[PDB]
Each structure stands twice: as C-alpha cells, then as structure tokens.
Design a binder for this molecule. Sequence first.
Ligand code: VQL
Lengths: 237, 300
Amino acid sequence: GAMNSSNYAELFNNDIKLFVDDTNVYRVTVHKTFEGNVATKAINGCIFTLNPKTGHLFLKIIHTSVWAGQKRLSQLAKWKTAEEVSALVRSLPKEEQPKQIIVTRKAMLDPLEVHMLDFPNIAIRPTELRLPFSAAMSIDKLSDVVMKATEPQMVLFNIYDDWLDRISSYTAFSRLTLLLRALKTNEESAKMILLSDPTITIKSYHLWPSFTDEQWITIESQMRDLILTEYGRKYNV
Amino acid sequence: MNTVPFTSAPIEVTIGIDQYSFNVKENQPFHGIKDIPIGHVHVIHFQHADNSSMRYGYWFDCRMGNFYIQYDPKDGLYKMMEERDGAKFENIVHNFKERQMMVSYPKIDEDDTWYNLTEFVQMDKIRKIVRKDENQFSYVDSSMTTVQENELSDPAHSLNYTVINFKSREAIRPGHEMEDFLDKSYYLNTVMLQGIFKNSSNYFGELQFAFLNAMFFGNYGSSLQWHAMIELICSSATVPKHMLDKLDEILYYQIKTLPEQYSDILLNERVWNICLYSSFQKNSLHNTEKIMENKYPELL
Ligand SMILES: CSc1nc(N)nc(-c2csc(C)n2)n1
C-alpha cells in the first residue's frame, strides 16, 4: 500500500523498486495570441524514473511531437507515462525488473496498473510523502538534455554521482531530496549555494559538484537554512 | 394461476412472494400461496421471526413442476421440494383451497411491477449461476458469496455470475490501454454482449437477477454485480440506443421498488453519480435520473 514516513527504510532494502514521477511529462508555456486569447505552447518534458537504492535514473525524454493532434493532454500524459514505464520494464531482464513501482501522484495508479496487467507480480503503490522530484528540471544537465532533444530519447544517469562510494543509500537519498526540496523552494538561492565556489567543479560524468565530506556538510546545512527561511518569508514567522 | 402449498408452518416467519410479504405465527394454520401468475419467474423467501439473520428463498417457475414448501426441523428452514405425483399434488392443493388455508398472490391488475423487474430472467440461466442440477428451483441466501468474491470459499454454494473486471486483460486490449479503460465500449459490445451474453436481453436477465438477490436477501456480492453491469454500460460511449432505453426502464423500476430505508446499503454513490452526471450516458437515463433525484437526492 501507500508509502509514508513509517515504511521509509523499505526504499533501501534489496527489493528492486522504482519511483515514477510524471510532473514534468507535459510542460507548457502560456502566452497571448494576436487576437488577445490565451494559448499554450508545449515544451519537451521527461519522465523521472528513479531507483532509490542505486541512484540509477531512467530519464525518458518526452518530445513535444508526441502531443501533436491529441486532445486532453494532461490526461494523456499520465497514460503516456504509464506506457513508457511499461516499455521500460519489458526491456529490462527479468532479474532487473522492479518488484514495486511507487508513483508520486495518485492519478498515475490506474494508468500504470492497466499498463502493467502483464506483470501481476509487480506492485503499483502510491505514497503519502511530498517528494520534490518536480525540481528535477532544476538540475542543469538534466534540463539541458531534455530541451535539446529532437526526438523521443532515453538517457541514463546516476543521480547520486559517486556518493555511494562514501555513504549509504539512505543518506544519499536524504541528500538528494534536501537538494531538490531547496531547488524547488528557491531555485536561485539553491543554485547560488551549490556553485558559489569556482574551485569545486562538476565532473563531466556527474550532475552535482565534487564536494568533500566536510564541504557537503556545509552545503547540507545551507540548504536547510534556505528551506526554513523560505518557510518564514512565506508564512512570515 | 399456480399454487405453492405448505405442509405446515411450525415456526414464526415472514414469508415473501415476489414483492409481497406477510407474517405467519408459530403453528398458525397456513397452507401456502394460491393464484400465482403463471408465465414469470418467482421467488418465495423467508425470514425467521427469531433470527432476522439469513434471509433465504427459492427461485422457481411454475411451468417446470409442482413445487411445495415443507419445514425441516433438522436443518431448521423452509425447504422447497418437487412433487412428481401430479395427481397427489392437485388433490392436496384442492383440499387446502377448499378449506381456504391459502393466501392469494395479491396482484393489482394495474401493476406491472413484477413483470418490469423480471422481464428477461430465464429460469434455466438462473440454474447455471446457482448450480444445483438435481433441483428445478434455486436456493439463494444473504451469505452466499460470488465466484469472483472467492477469487479475491465453497464453490458449490456460490453465485457464478459473469466475471466483470475493468482492470483485466479481458477488458483491456494491448495497445489500447488508455482507450479501452476510459471508454469500455469494446469490453461491453464485443467481449461481453457478443462473446458471453449473445444479446442485450441476456445482459438484462443477469442484471435483473443480480438486483433482486441484493434486494430480497441483502446479498452483497449480487449488489456488487448489479453495480458492475450498470457501470460497464455507463462507462461505454457506444451503446445501442435500444439498450439504453431499456436500461432506463429497468433501473427505473428497480429504484422505484427499493425500500426507502435500504438506500444507504444497496446503492453505490460512485457508480450512480457516474451514470447520471459524469459518464457518456449522463444524458440518456431520463426516467432513472428523475426518480433518483426525487427519491434519493441525498445520495448524489
Ligand atoms: C437470470 S440470469 C440470466 N438471465 C439471462 N436471460 N441470460 C443470462 C445469461 C448469462 S450468460 C448468457 C448467455 N445468458 N443469465
């Protein structure tokens, strides 16, 4: 059933599971037309499918061509998401298929469940966590590959860089969601924090800067301060 | 007109015949029910004065034999049985009418209620859902579970109802996942009507059967079946106009006949708001929608 604070550590056991987030699958700008009416223009999106134990990210890029001539795109996006996740499971070898897929939004349960009827033994589950994976497009290299895509494309990443060489997946996941929670609440400040010091670079095969253990500690506290603050600035406290 | 005699009434009980009911006292001189309309299926049903738990009863068609009721003090219930000695049966019936120990099936001439509730209920078809071949009549009670309920525990006492499942490979064509799940016309028209029922009359036959078992016995799996079969039509954009029109009549009489106080348990808010307000058929069930709003506006 639902995932929440109490069954948090299940994410880090040795059962293959994926999170699916569909919040960036269907993206639009809203603009005025010559006649003064409003219109949307779609932009490339992506399905964020993440193994929280390994950090493997299966970033399925949704090119705007998939929407051409379709109606009710917001509804279609959910079914397109489910179609792509299904295709992804089927392409994995059996021993790599997940035993659970956790959708970050309840509206995905029915579409995925229906697409996954061939896999009765894979549990489709919701969550009560408020996970910040929508901020995934605030990671520069992920936004970059999405916005440049000219066709549907799947790109593989490790969203933890090499962190698992030195920390556990529980810790790695907590660092990731703190980083993403901050990037979601104040993208400019969050990004300033991450890149202020020019001597800490991002390796070509990585997504985040190459912080030492101690530098990560200072970074982590700074992102904490940022979040607590924006919470004040917002509720005036 | 047919007669269902009773050997005797040893225990206080409320007896139902179709939509009619009457109290009988312990060892009151009651010998059964006369003037029953030939040409329809009937149900005679029982609730003991001592144990309102377990409503139970028997579906039967008078054309398929001479049937009578006899209390069994070992099993503790009124059992239907067949008399094959037709001479013995007419003799018995005539004696009890002469002594006027029978209640008259009390049909008002204006009233088509039972016909409208049972228009397509075949009795041979009931036998293939309440499987008990050595008997020409079929026993149902409040507690019997359905075959699909035993999937999600005795199969002999089960209600083999047509299995409907909206999230199933049967319902969902590969490559049309979104399409078949939002518009179930293919599941209804090809899989169910063309593959299982043969025609809408048979769809209605089971649907009516499912409702009556929910109403007369508060059988929960039947109530679920009635709502499933409604939901499948209301979730289909493409339904023959004649089925829609007949569904509206059907549901109208069922809603009309329901006890006003049983509404909270026998009606699924979600399915009915869908049929009446959200679904493709929101505009197509005029009689059903009018009686629901005037009689159960609380549900919607
Ligand atoms: C009363 S139960 C009932 N009634 C009718 N008229 N048909 C059916 C039925 C189910 S499947 C099939 C071919 N006929 N079931």
